[PDB]
Ligand binder design. Structure first.
Ligand code: HPY
Ligand code: HPY
Ligand code: FE
Ligand code: FE
Lengths: 423, 423
């Protein structure tokens, strides 16, 4: 029966703050002039940072926890990954998908993630994973708001009954329409697939999230069609272009021309640093390109960009604990957003920007919003990132749904000394 | 008064093992056929992984904890970094250096690091940091064996009295001779500086560790002189080429020719992933090169290569907690050593390979060696890396010098559930 969050630090704000809770919502936020005493019904943030929940804007829960089954992706490429997944997709069962999705979802709850957008492969006449994921969505609702993207992994026009299956997925309840233009047989199929994707999103009033130009091909420019169609339909807010790794390889003049449209369109962008650094640059010898989209430039231009984990122990990525601060750490390094302020502001890439990408309507520490927030045992975004701190408490609807008792390290010198890695 | 380490897993070995300790050394190692019972004087590894101590083969303890003083490195380049450091170097004091070096050394002890090689800038007539570091070396000896590299940061031939100061540093006790050929005014000064570096190492019987070709210049090939001189003097084991980031930009034909010499010479290589990904590629627009040396190819050719953290919160790197598993994580991603076996074998890059780089004579879990070892709460190298586990216990001379009580995470679902991120 929590009534208040006290001694809280807030990004971009000076001092400590008190967050009053009432009926599962935030009733008011007031600044404090000093440290407040703890008491019953008060959750002490202990001068730690309080922020809305971490968000996972791009993950594949249907493939999670399947790395090496039946075989391993030896080349470390997107293309072999799809082929290795195809082998596993043929062996899927309802319970298998639910068990694995839930295992990763629990790690996400433990990591303060209360909003997740999972893509689900719908290039499968049986739609096995989709049916399973729709049940998981209902089951996990008390802890995570899960969005499902109908993702035509093998193409819309390049796979038998691809468009029909994509629409069937929407009729069954998928929240977002997906696409993968660079994987279609031809550039023309790629462009046409986007017109079909947008028509379905308008027909069913759904969001859009395209696996867009995930390839080191300077000629892969499907992103301009995604942005142009969004601008034409006046629906930028509901549209997302995931990856756009090809943008890392575009010449600067085209990119500058393109950026005007990206900003005017208002669409969202997702970069997946852990997976992008691994799968991109695989066709170069030396030097080897990084392959992440132009994150730094998007931020400088006011274009909404955010980070996703993409994969957790599957054909496209053998690692992960579904930790967003870890995803952010990799992104800041590869994108060279290493200035103090850029690092400190990094939290935006895994909180607010991701919420906008998911078109969330109830997100942020503000009066009237649901009492969904997490507490990090750190002074600010920089500190949280540097020390890769766990989530001390995760609060949803005004109730604690996860907590982590921090590790305790001691070094035995002339006398025992506690080490917290702070300066 | 520990007498045994029980229930230990060892890299590359099947089953559990018992490590008997006697007089501060490992007396014997025996395989177990099942789980052994705990008892007084027995340290239970609890089926966790036991390995010799982590090693930090390349760090700058004289500059650590000084990021932003007096100003920040705004460009994120090696060159501005040196210039920003120059401003701080002018404000150094004995106690200042000792305090900061010790702060980072404590984090290293907490992180199971018992061997550290620190470079110390000796392009300073007062040799302030060097005098301070020599005292720190004596002070920290019970927990860490610290090697000091006399590092002529501003060049040997390109800085006033550079060679004289370098030799003075050796006469005062520095363990390793350093150099920085790519920073010298001319290619000729670069080559000549290496002849002088080798002559000093032979005159004083010291090791060598060159900041070698840390620049995105395909024409920076000082590494061939380092390797050739080592081969000529028959001293490969005592020589290290740090960085060699220029190798990331060499054409393949020259690299192939060069590799024959690298292998024949027997010299060591250090890659610094966290810093290299940040400082390299800064002169590219898009695409942007990764800039780490050819780690994967060195491993395939049997060339000894290892990883260092390089910097901890200073002019060249604003982050860090001096954690080697974190350094390894970045290196595996950027170097694309992402196959299951490559990741699992990754521990070698921060243990055995680094010990060879430091020319250590008492290292490894073997009968007769000092009882210096650490325990990771993980099943193998892959698991330790994936979950970024802390060091449960660090043992030196048969005594516990550091321990970490792991964090405890719980998610409150229909019932409370402990989350350990394992599969
Ligand atoms: O096409 C893809 N499928 C799964 C992961 C990666 O994001 N790309
Ligand atoms: O020349 C250098 N000084 C400090 C760090 C970096 O390793 N390079
Ligand atoms: Fe994806
Ligand atoms: Fe260095």
């Amino acid at each position: 029966a929590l009534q208040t969050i006290i001694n809280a630090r807030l990004p971009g704000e000076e001092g400590l703050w008190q967050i009053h809770l009432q009926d599962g919502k935030i009733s008011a936020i007031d600044a404090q002039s000093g440290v407040m005493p703890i008491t019953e019904n008060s959750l002490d943030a202990e001068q730690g940072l309080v922020i809305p929940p971490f968000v996972e804007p791009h993950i594949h829960l249907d493939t999670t926890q399947t790395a090496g089954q039946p075989n391993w992706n030896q080349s470390g490429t997107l293309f072999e990954g799809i082929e290795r997944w195809a082998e596993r997709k043929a062996l899927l069962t309802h319970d298998d998908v639910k068990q694995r999705a839930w295992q990763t979802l629990k790690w996400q709850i433990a990591n303060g993630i209360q909003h997740v957008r999972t893509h689900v492969d719908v290039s499968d006449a049986t739609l096995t994973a989709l049916k399973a994921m729709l049940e998981v969505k209902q089951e996990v609702a008390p802890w995570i708001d899960l969005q499902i993207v109908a993702f035509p992994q093998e193409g819309i026009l390049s796979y038998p009954n691809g468009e029909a299956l994509l629409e069937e997925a929407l009729r069954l309840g998928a929240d977002v329409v997906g696409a993968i233009p660079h994987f279609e047989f031809t550039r023309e199929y790629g462009v046409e697939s986007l017109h079909k994707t947008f028509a379905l999103a308008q027909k069913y009033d759904r969001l859009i999230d395209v696996h867009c130009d995930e390839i080191d091909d300077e000629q892969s420019r499907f992103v301009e069609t995604v942005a142009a169609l969004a601008h034409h339909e006046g629906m930028g807010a509901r549209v997302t272009a995931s990856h756009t790794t090809a943008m890392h390889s575009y010449n600067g003049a085209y990119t500058s021309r393109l950026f005007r449209l990206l900003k005017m369109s208002g669409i969202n962008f997702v970069a997946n640093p852990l997976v992008n650094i691994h799968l991109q640059g695989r066709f170069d010898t030396y030097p080897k390109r990084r392959g992440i989209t132009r994150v730094k430039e998007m931020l400088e231009s006011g274009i909404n960009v955010c980070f996703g984990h993409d994969d957790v122990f599957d054909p496209w990525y053998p690692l992960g604990t579904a930790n967003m601060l870890q995803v952010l750490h990799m992104g800041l390094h590869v994108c060279q957003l290493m200035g103090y302020g850029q690092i400190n502001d990094g939290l935006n890439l895994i909180t607010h920007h991701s919420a906008r990408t998911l078109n969330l309507q109830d997100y942020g520490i503000a009066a009237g919003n649901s009492a969904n927030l997490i507490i990090l045992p750190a002074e600010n975004g920089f500190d949280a990132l540097r020390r890769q701190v766990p989530v001390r408490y995760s609060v949803r609807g005004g109730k604690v749904i996860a907590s982590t008792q921090p590790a305790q390290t001691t070094v035995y010198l002339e006398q025992p000394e506690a080490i917290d890695y702070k300066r």
